[PDB]
Amino acid sequence: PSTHGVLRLMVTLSGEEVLEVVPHIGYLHTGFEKTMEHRTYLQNITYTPRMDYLHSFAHDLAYALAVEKLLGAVVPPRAETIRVILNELSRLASHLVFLGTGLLDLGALTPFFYAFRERETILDLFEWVTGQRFHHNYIRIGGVKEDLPEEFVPELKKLLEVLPHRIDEYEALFAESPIFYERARGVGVIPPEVAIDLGLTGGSLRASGVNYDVRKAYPYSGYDVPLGERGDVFDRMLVRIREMRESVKIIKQALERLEPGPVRDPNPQITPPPRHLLETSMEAVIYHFKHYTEGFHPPKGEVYVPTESARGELGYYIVSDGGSMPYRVKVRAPSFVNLQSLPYACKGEQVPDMVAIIASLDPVMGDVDR
Amino acid sequence: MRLERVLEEARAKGYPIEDNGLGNLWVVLPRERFKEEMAHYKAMGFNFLADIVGLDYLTYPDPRPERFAVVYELVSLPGWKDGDGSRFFVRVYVPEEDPRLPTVTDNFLEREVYDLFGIVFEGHPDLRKILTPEDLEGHPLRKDYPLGETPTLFREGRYIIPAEFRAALTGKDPGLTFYKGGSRKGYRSLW
Amino acid sequence: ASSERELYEAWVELLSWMREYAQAKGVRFEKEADFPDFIYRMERPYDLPTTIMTASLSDGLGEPFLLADVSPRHAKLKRIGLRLPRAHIHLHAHYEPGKGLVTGKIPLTKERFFALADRAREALAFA
Amino acid sequence: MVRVKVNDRIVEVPPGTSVMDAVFHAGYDVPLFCSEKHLSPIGACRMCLVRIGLIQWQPKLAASCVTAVADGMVVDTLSDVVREAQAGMVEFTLLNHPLDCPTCDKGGACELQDRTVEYGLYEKLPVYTRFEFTRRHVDKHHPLSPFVILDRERCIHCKRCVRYFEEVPGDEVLDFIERGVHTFIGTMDFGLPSGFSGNITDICPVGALLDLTARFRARNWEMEETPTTCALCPVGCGITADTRSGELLRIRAREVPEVNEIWICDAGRFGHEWADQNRLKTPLVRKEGRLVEATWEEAFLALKEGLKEARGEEVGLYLAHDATLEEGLLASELAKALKTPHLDFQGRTAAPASLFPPASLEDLLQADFALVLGDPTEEAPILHLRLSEFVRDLKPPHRYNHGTPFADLQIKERMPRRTDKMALFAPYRAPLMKWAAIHEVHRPGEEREILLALLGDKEGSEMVAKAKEAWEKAKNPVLILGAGVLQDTVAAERARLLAERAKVLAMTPAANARGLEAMGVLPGAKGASWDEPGALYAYYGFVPPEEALKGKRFVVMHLSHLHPLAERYAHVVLPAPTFYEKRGHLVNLEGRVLPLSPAPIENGEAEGALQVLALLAEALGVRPPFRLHLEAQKALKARKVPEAMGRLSFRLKELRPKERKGAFYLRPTMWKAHQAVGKAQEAARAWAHPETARAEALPEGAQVAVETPFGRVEARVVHREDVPKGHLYLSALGPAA
Amino acid sequence: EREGILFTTLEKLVAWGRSNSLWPATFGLACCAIEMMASTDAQADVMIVAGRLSKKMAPVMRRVWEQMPDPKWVISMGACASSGGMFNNYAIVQNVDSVVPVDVYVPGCPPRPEALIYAVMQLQKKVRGQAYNERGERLPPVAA
């Protein structure tokens, strides 16, 4: 019985109630991993956001980080900040949807009518600073493209003044609600609980293994409370609604330490000369002219860095070969591995429940088929 | 992070250790002693949150042992009990005409082991099923497989074949200026 | 300084001369290059007279026999100069309030210029 | 050999090696700017600086390009001091530049740029430039050659160009003027007289000195590079043809040490104006007493229906001079199967070049003397540049890990030329007569007497004697001849000469001739030759002399353009490709096998000759194993023909004398007639040496008309006949009034 | 007979009709799939392709097209569908029009929802035929 879910993926399940589920993906395979092997490290930035396309910024970042370290660039204090405010602002964006699809299958339509408003509100914020609804070409190797507009902070305040509580109302809905058929047998328990199905159920699993708390790699100093719990399909839902909570305390927290200054590493071999002086520039004209035609050349080597648990552990494994284009780029891509859990996840339970069983893993095809 | 230390510790006998300036250190293992050794790494068996990648060194500036190579990433999950964070890679160069490599599916890296056969060559021996998460004919990731691109089209019969239009340079390419590369033969900032 | 303003205002004139003298004597006048200070100007300001920074009076084959050029608005020790190719002769013109455009203490009048352009054209013209 | 430790890498390198080359050999780098392959390394442009020692550190940095290496030497190129140094030099080099990059035609293929971005800025906020003063302003974009070469007198001061001029062609037509921060590039020999002027374009590490033949067309990377061989003459140099969107933008020289060095004559470099433009794209066919387009299907039928009246009755095959090695073979085999034949090249010499054993350019340099009988400068242009090095007692350099050397101390700036190493004999005060002490001007078609004397069987002019006495003293000399190869009477003894000594350089009027001869595309016995009509039903891959179209019944011309003669005497026309867009092999005048690759040029995508021969072969009967390339190769590999870069040995002792008489001499030339377009307009259309006086109603520099068996053409002061491809015969008089 | 005022004014009256009986049957793939959902503020014809048409996906969209009522249309949402996107590769189709005839291409990536609206409007104004548009030519209402 071959079926097409409701998220561009094929799943074959011989089972009369639930047996072996053979998922066939590759329907959105775009070859990213290879096409990037034919683009500027700068050009690649436009490619990174088209894989998770929800919490894109996670990729943007994770990729920059690899390269930044690779060629020893250093991010300005005020950038690091933007890069989390931005990153976590998107983390919310990703979850606002997971929570969205959780609302319909349930019934709460009045609330759903809000969720996809908070969303549009966040997205509006993006178009404010980056000029694009998404795939914002903002993160730059040295930091970010350009300083954020005067209208970003205030508006972020209007959305940061309501959500504080408007998360509990979403918790006060999936928790204390009578629709308890949420405690499905979907037990992502290869070894344990949900705290990992919250992060990266790769097989062996965990409870508080948040790659951005442990193996802390980028800006982090946040006293940021990770939400990992027990149970299994009821929590997968609850948990992520939980992450939204303090994920905002992060936005607030980091919105505090926002003092003006430089937004990207000035090191000329890594960044273009302020386009302000080409009317004099040594021949920084040369730099500019070169910087955009043939890019910079990171040292021969091989790096990788596990990025924020943006819907799961993530990281780019770039192989520089002293050229203007990466020699090889492998994206970890969480979903693609989280999807291995699914066969078991919904191994022994009623088919009718096998929908939320999957949506509970919050897989994104562009992320898996990449 | 003990575990990690104990790793190299003993493996400091016959195995080479490649370390990069950034916190990404990893160990190479010969062909043979991989199966058992990789298994041995089940010693306090890094929880095995293993992630993996398939590299093809053909068309690389500096020559390496064998054309294809594989990397794995064994890690001791920190939120468990004996999880401290011990993370490190491990690689194994694989023969061009003998693309084999015992699976490690012994929750795991089902997909990975597959992925590679999929895109690159690989072709692990033992394995539940060598499913294919790509499409059909040949192998793509391999550097000698055309990226297969169509010229972008414009009006009056003007077309741009990307291959020839790229300004960027592939580490192996000599550049547009005679035979030369300088502080653009790679570049890492000091400190 | 207001001195800068005048200099350029002068450069425009000096140019006007060169054009006058070229069309008049049947010799070719040519704009050699415009200010990068302007080509790459972008949404930035610019209230300066012309874009022309280096002009010349060339002969039949082209070889120039008189080069005039003023320094860009972003340079220091501003000055407008005259140079006779092939014959080691360089002239630096500064601006002075009242006395006007001088080449030191001696004024650079339309007449003088022409006389200079003339002598120069006379001797250095290949065609 | 010496042992030099560069940095952490040790290397064995010959004794006369340059620290520079040492470095690059070791696999390192240093700002290259004034130095250049094949030019005299000099100190200017203090860039290739380095620190040396023996260990003791030399007090001051050295010019890695003019500094010789020594046993046990240590050359560091990364010391904080060295970089701070390079860094500074660039700063200076850039200090007075103008800021034209986006605007500049040197695109990302600029040396100043790469080195700037390379070693450029040095740091231990960032300061891009500290010079806030008025930059140098001079003359910009004033075209030296109304033809090519447009320079921006706003260059760095390397010497590559003037240096080049005085060293390679030997025609100093550019030098510096005035001095100090004012020195610039001016001239006084306005049209840039010499051939070989183009090369300065390829060498100039910056924006002044640019190829105007292709100014403002596309940016350097945008171009689609297609490397192949120029087939306008026998030397088959090496090139790269930049094309973009089906049109041909410019030509560059491709380095090939063995044959063409890295130079390119101007005719070949700027003579591309034509393929670019006006060309035939659809086969035309004569219907209704006029020519009208058709389809290959049509043309074919109308083709067969013109040969179905007479089958296998002396069919004629005549290929163009630039016919590939395959196209030749095919044409051959087809004439074999077709028992009634007699084929030929667009310029096959009465005396087969396969007579004289192929001599190499490599050899030429190592020869001991050069007896020449035909202005190489027009015959095989590059031979001039080679002799340039010959007269300088220069021997082929040592190859390093990076091929040909950047700083070859072997070459000194302004070296003295030996006039006692060469003897020139040609119908006019030839250019290379300058480096010839033994040099005499004679009369058209009278080269025999000279060689005769040279054999020792007769008397001759003093010089011929000094030449004899010369040729006699020489151990391993080389004979160079090219025009009088069409007067077997002479060529016969030319051979005899060599034998008794000895290799030769045959400057054939037809390129790849040496190759077609190896294919047997010759008439042999009875029959008519390329300019000799008579046969019936023929295939012309080029426009023959009018007298050859007349009389024939059916004629198919496989032209690539539309010559009038075709639209008035031809029955079927078939659009062909230029050598620039053909795939296939070639046989150099030194018997070398040079390749030919296709360029994305826009032709009426109307097939090559491989298809046509094969096609027209259908109308006749059999279908020889030739159709496509990949399969036609086995055909060549069959006859055991060296493949790439290989040298093919194949003698031939047979000659078909057809001696001609007349008052006109088609003087061999560099440029070919079908090049008179665009900027080549005036460098192609047709002075006190041979006797045939002025008083014939021919004024000084007046535009007249002239008719010879090879057609009608206009000229001026025309000493004899300026010409195109494949001809150096004497012919019929006719200056129509 | 065909071009008579009778038959003409009829079909033209019909088309104006079928002009508003258009039933958007979205067939989204990647990122586009999400940005086209913001236009849903309240058999099948007029299928909208919004996303990267993988080659593995290719044959499928086809079968889903063939299985529609002849009077149908195709709108290509954003790059990927329209042109080979920014992905020239073995993985993706260069132009959805290579399988299912396209009537209106929409230049986004992802195009604001509104972009999509104006998009069908053009489809709308075409099915009518009241919209012949470039070289000055009369545009057919269907695709085939």
Added chain:
Amino acid sequence: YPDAPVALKPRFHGRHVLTRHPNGLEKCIGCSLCAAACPAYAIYVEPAENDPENPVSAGERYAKVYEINMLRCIFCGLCEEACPTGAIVLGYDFEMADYEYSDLVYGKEDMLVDVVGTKPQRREAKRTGKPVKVGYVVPYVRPELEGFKAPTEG
């Protein structure tokens, strides 16, 4: 809401626009950079020599042919970015879906700032004989796009 204009934020990535200086010159000097930085290879450029008399751009070079294949474009600022003159900037228009493929490649005439609607908008509006009412509005025109006419009411 196709009757009530869309209010998008300035900085929004829209139809490309080529700007001019007050003097009236095209800022753009035919340097194929923007084209080079394009990741989808959606720009083709042909340069020409400025006619000494009756010039086009400031420098000695101007863009004879400047085309962008709007379908291949991904609307990713990079080009506007790479430009060394500030010529190409990103307009606000977006109502530009069309019919024939090859008619989605905007030319120079289709992009200068003196222009108003989009290829498809001006088109129908040609026979319509009724002006182009653009479906958007911004708080103000970006500094960079100075000279671009639009519903600034914002």
